[PDB]
């Protein structure tokens, strides 16, 4: 919420930068690069590298605390990431359900929005 890079979350109290912040630095010696990233759900960078980066962050954080409850919370989050690394999806098709391997990112998870922002940054 206090990090300007995260446009989805940044806000002083509750309101987002709904007009955006891109025109401040537009100039004749400046260029703005913009990219649509809505199709990067099953991209290779949302596979093992992304989850394992989060897991490494959690492993580092586990050494910064002496509370067993905080350590258990971090362990459960790490286990969620480990499980989601090797995940399958169900899709109906007439009378047959396709189980398709999917170790990538998708919405419907608590961390999806913030994790996607982190990975994109």
């Amino acid at each position: 919420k206090h990090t300007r890079e995260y446009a989805e979350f940044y806000s002083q109290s509750n309101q987002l930068l709904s007009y955006g912040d891109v025109t401040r630095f537009l100039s004749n010696n400046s260029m703005v690069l913009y990219t649509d990233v809505s199709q990067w759900d099953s991209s290779q960078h949302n596979t093992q590298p992304f989850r394992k980066g989060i897991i490494m962050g959690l492993d580092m954080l586990a050494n910064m605390t002496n509370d067993a409850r905080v350590i258990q919370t971090l362990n459960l989050y790490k286990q969620t990431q480990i499980n989601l690394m090797d995940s399958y999806v169900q899709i109906p098709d007439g009378n047959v359900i396709k189980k398709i391997q999917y170790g990538a990112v998708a919405s419907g998870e608590k961390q999806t929005k913030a994790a996607n922002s982190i990975a994109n940054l």
Partner: protein, 121 residues
């Protein structure tokens, strides 16, 4: 098809004064002037987009875009914004979950990626 050209059109209009976000809805206004720098490849892409429009049976919308392209002025840009907004009112595309998912999870994973970049990421 109809919404594609907008992504390029925004890059063809010079800035003669603009807004600048300060805090979440607060705008300070600049009299800054910025010229639009457009390479020939972008114009080729816009030409291809209009060709795709015409290949789908569109005559009036590409003609309007071409007419606006004579000056690329912000005063007549409301027609471009009108076309952009109107494109979304042709309804939803409620295709089968199988096809939509398969489109989403259409991946070409490779071992030929830059290891250095992935480790840094």
């Amino acid at each position: 098809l109809v919404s594609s050209p907008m992504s390029i059109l925004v890059a063809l209009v010079d800035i003669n004064g603009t807004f600048i976000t300060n805090e979440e809805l607060e705008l300070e206004f600049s009299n800054k002037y910025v010229r639009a720098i457009v390479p020939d490849q972008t114009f080729d892409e816009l030409k291809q987009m209009l060709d795709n429009m015409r290949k789908a049976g569109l005559t009036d919308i590409p003609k309007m875009i071409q007419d606006w392209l004579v000056d690329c002025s912000i005063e007549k840009f409301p027609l471009m914004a009108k076309i952009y907004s109107w494109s979304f009112h042709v309804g939803f595309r409620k295709q089968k979950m199988l096809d939509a998912a398969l489109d989403q999870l259409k991946t070409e994973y490779t071992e030929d990626v830059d290891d250095e970049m992935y480790r840094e990421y």
